[PDB]
């Protein structure tokens, strides 16, 4: 044992202004992410200081089991999000990925069924990808970003801008 109920300090986030952009500009993933972030008190503003961007989202399918007749029997769907954070003048601070995967049972003789099943399964995965993204934003502070951005500019403007014509 040793537990306690989650205090209001731990459910709340450290920042309030964030911009949210994706390559799938109005896809389900980003819409549900913005819905989740604004229900915790994070205002999703175009003018916010730090843009979180979802640059790639891939949804691979692979077979893991076979039938008695060496045909495919179980599919593993895999949804993966590639995310970057940018602060000012399009400079990247952090970059990482989140990934989840679930498996379902395919039916050679019920294809509309199986496509339905995989669909509802992709929905559940989308909600888990978002849980795990906001789980990472809650452990982030608006002060962390500022000093990481001062260091990123101390590496990018101090070393690279030293070569401008002659």
């Amino acid at each position: 044992c040793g537990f306690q109920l989650r205090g209001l300090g731990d459910a709340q986030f450290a920042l309030k202004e964030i911009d949210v952009s994706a390559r799938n500009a109005y896809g389900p993933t980003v819409r549900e992410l913005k819905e989740t972030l604004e229900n915790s008190g994070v205002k999703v503003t175009s003018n916010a200081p730090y843009h979180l961007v979802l640059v790639r989202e891939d949804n691979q399918q692979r077979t893991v089991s076979y039938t008695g007749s060496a045909r495919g029997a179980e599919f593993e769907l895999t949804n993966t999000i590639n995310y970057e954070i940018v602060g000012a003048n399009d400079l990247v601070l952090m970059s990482n990925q989140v990934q989840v995967q679930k498996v379902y049972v395919h039916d050679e003789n019920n294809l509309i069924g199986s496509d339905q099943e995989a669909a509802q399964l992709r929905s559940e995965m989308r909600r888990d990808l978002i849980q795990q993204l906001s789980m990472r934003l809650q452990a982030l502070t608006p002060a962390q970003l500022d000093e990481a951005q001062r260091q990123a500019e101390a590496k990018a403007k101090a070393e690279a801008e030293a070569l401008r014509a002659a």
Binding site: R31, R62, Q120
Partner: protein, 824 residues
């Protein structure tokens, strides 16, 4: 010696290949080492000199001249520069041991260790001369292209006024000593405008021994342009014999390319295949076509056989940046048996169908509309014709609401299911039956088509606090069917003492309360600060029972039991069966979280408690079945107050290895229904080490029995009990082994097996693989069978010929070993 004797670079010039700008590995910067591979002995690094990056305009820059002495001869008006002569002019520099200017003509001659330099380009030769009036030049010679790590030689090289360079007796990527392979064109022409070059009497040589001839050949030369040739794949299988595949790659633009796969197959013929891929900020797509006139007539008099064999398709997605999203996923094939015969690049798991789908999607702020035309084309003759959704219109969304109030959600679907049943009966030459199409086993409502409407409003009140939540919600589901049924299916119902009611409606409410808590204990395991969470959850679900035994089944399936089964409003998918539920699901999760918020491991267990019996089920698990004498193994799981125990768990270790596992034990019968453990390993430091270990058991599948026209539960023929091992590992500095094995315990057969080695070197690479798999097979009597195939795979790779792009001849290595991204 003194001339170009093939293979190696001239060592008479310099002992240590200094003249080629060659620097051995032990004297290179780390930044330079980073540009060469792990086994390369050094690099060509061009000496630094003023004007490399200024460009080379003709009279834009003063000429820099330097030499030790000069002299002049009066009878032949030649002006000479002796000593170590060097002449640069912007980018181009010229070094020699003596520089004669023949002023009667306008001819500059260079005698001595001649070096012609430009940005990233070096030529070393014994003599060179240039007319100064028009650009005409001749060199007598070896050349280094530092960027591409390439070298070569020519007996002479000439340049005409219009800038067209000609080489006599010409290229290679190998380090000077290596002599491993050279490409020799007896007459080479390089046009800088148009950016194409030509070689006549073109010869691929290996250790100075020719191995390939052609009297003409084309290729681009203007930097990196839209072509390249790919490492050929020499294979041998038991259904194509000796095989050669020689793919060619067009790098058409920075946003799209295309590949062309001509295969020759001893037992099949000359198969021609090609793909076009494209990618933009707002779209992406891939187009595939393939044709072959197959010389194999083993499948003669088989159903739907075609001696021509072709496939075309487009998989497309456009408008990711806008609210309008247009996806296509369409493929068509000539005959069912296509992938059973021509998919020798994949081995195990040839698909039994191909998608034919268009979908438009408007994606508003509050709502989402989607129009979707979708069918399937069967790659088999032993599966029932699938229904196709010709319209499926779909609106899903909510109503803008005030924070902390009600949440109103609506969803509607209209959809028209149809299909053309193919129930031909095939007889032998005598009176008996040869084979029966599976569609012929569908009876009654199983032969139905029709339109279906579905409205689903609902309301939810999510009362949530940091320490937990309770969200009750009520929904209403109205469905209306307009069915059609052929006369066959109606008489099938007369015999069952039933009658066909075309118009059919169903209305049901759905009450669902969800509530859970949030707990957080801080621990430190293995000296690391973990924030272990504890989230219990409970869901009450009430859906009243309504008889649905007179409603066909189009898009409904019954998933196997798992930890997600706990939280779903319906134990079926789709709209064709709604499960009478009066139940409470209980479960608990516990995530371990690092300081960064990265979830490092998770564990979940759960159970459902059934107050009522579960009466509605698929066709064949209600009372229309179980009339076949006894009940199945665990199919009689109606009227049991308890679902199986659901266990799941995940452990990821910093993107180096991850292991997932789940278990499902049924106490009502004391029997394991479903379990699995999957381990994947692939470090970041060395992506060349890769290990996959997996076990999968499942006997609780509910699938459609192709000969009974109905669903079944306990199908001992298809119980999954399988392990999958695969590894890719490096033995000794230049060698690495890779293999994979997948074994079907339930029938005690190996499904796939293959192993091979992979020798790597500075300029070339060899991969050899012996393989054995089980291919999906349909016989002449419309019966599924297992057809073993053996095969052997050979790949030889000349590094640096535009083949750094994914080859489709390696599919069985990509699919069969997660981790195939060896990046070097």
């Amino acid at each position: 010696l003194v001339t170009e004797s093939g293979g190696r670079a001239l060592k008479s010039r310099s002992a240590d290949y200094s003249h080629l700008d060659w620097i051995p590995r032990e004297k290179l910067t780390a930044a330079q080492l980073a540009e060469i591979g792990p086994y390369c002995g050094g690099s060509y690094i061009e000496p630094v000199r003023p004007g490399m990056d200024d460009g080379a305009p003709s009279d834009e820059s003063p000429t820099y001249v330097s030499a030790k002495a000069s002299r002049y001869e009066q009878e032949k008006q030649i002006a000479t520069l002796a000593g170590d002569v060097v002449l640069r002019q912007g980018s181009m520099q010229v070094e020699g041991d003596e520089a004669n200017l023949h002023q009667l003509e306008n001819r500059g001659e260079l005698v001595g260790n001649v070096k012609l330099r430009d940005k990233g380009m070096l030529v070393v030769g014994d003599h060179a001369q240039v007319q100064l009036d028009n650009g005409e030049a001749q060199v007598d010679a070896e050349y280094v292209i530092h960027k591409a790590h390439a070298r070569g030689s020519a007996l002479y090289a000439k340049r005409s006024e219009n800038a067209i360079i000609m080489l006599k007796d010409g290229y290679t990527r190998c380090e000077p000593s290596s002599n491993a392979w050279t490409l020799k064109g007896n007459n080479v022409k390089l046009n800088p405008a148009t950016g194409f070059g030509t070689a006549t009497n073109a010869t691929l040589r290996v250790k100075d021994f020719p191995v390939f001839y052609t009297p003409y050949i084309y290729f681009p030369i203007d930097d990196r342009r839209q072509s390249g040739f790919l490492p050929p794949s020499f294979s041998s299988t038991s259904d194509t014999g000796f095989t050669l595949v020689t793919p060619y790659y067009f790098n058409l633009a920075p946003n799209y390319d295309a590949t062309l796969y001509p295969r020759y197959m001893a037992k099949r013929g000359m198969m021609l295949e090609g793909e076009f891929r494209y990618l933009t900020h707002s779209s992406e797509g891939i187009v595939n076509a393939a044709y072959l006139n197959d010389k194999d007539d083993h499948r003669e008099g088989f159903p739907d056989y075609s001696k021509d064999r072709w496939l075309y398709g487009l998989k497309n997605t456009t408008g990711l940046d806008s609210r309008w999203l247009a996806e296509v996923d369409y493929t068509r094939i000539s005959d069912p048996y296509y992938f059973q015969d021509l998919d020798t690049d994949l081995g195990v798991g040839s698909t039994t169908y191909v998608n034919q789908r268009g979908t438009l999607t408007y994606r508003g702020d509050t709502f989402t509309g989607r129009l979707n035309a979708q069918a399937y084309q069967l790659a088999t003759t032993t599966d029932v014709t699938p229904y196709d959704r010709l319209p499926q219109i779909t609106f899903d969304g909510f109503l803008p609401y005030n924070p902390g109030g009600m949440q109103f959600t609506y969803g509607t679907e209209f959809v028209r299911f149809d299909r053309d049943l193919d129930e031909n009966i095939y007889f032998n030459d005598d009176g008996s039956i040869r084979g029966k199409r599976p569609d012929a086993s569908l009876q009654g409502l199983a032969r139905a088509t029709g339109d279906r409407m579905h409205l689903e409003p609902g309301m939810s009140l999510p009362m949530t606090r940091s320490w937990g939540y309770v969200t009750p919600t009520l929904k209403y589901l109205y469905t209306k069917y307009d069915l059609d049924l052929d006369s066959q299916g109606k008489t099938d119902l007369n015999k069952r003492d039933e009658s066909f009611d075309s118009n059919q409606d169903r209305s049901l409410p759905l009450v669902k309360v969800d509530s859970g808590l949030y707990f957080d204990r801080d621990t430190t395991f293995a000296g690391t600060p973990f924030r272990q969470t504890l989230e219990p959850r409970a869901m009450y679900l009430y859906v009243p029972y309504k008889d649905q035994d007179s409603l066909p089944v189009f898009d409904t399936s019954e998933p196997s039991f798992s930890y997600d089964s706990l939280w779903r409003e319906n134990r079926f998918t789709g709209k064709d069966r709604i499960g009478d539920a009066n139940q409470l699901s209980l479960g608990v999760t516990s995530r371990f979280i690092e300081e960064n918020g990265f979830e490092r491991a998770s564990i979940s267990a759960g159970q459902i408690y059934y107050f009522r019996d579960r009466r509605v089920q698929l066709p064949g698990l209600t009372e229309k079945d179980l009339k076949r004498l006894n009940l199945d193994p665990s199919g009689l799981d109606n009227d049991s107050w308890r679902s199986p125990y659901a266990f799941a768990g995940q452990y990821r270790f910093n993107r180096d290895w991850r292991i997932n596992s789940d278990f499902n034990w049924n106490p009502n019968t004391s029997r394991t229904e479903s379990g699995s453990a999957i381990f994947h390993y692939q470090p970041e430091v060395d992506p060349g080490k890769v290990v996959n270990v997996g076990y999968r058991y499942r006997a609780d599948a509910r699938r459609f029995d192709s000969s009974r026209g109905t669903f079944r539960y306990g199908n001992e023929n298809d119980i999954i009990k399988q392990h999958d091992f695969s590894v890719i590992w490096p033995l000794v500095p230049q060698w690495s082994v890779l293999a994979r094995w997948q074994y079907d315990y339930n029938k005690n057969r190996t499904l796939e097996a293959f192993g091979g080695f992979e020798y790597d070197s500075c300029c070339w690479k060899l991969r050899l693989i012996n393989r054995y798999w089980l291919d999906v097979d349909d016989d002449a009597f419309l019966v599924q069978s297992e057809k073993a195939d053996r095969g052997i795979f050979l790949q030889i790779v000349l590094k640096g010929l535009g083949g750094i792009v994914g080859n489709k001849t390696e599919m069985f290595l990509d699919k069969g070993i997660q981790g195939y991204r060896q990046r070097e």
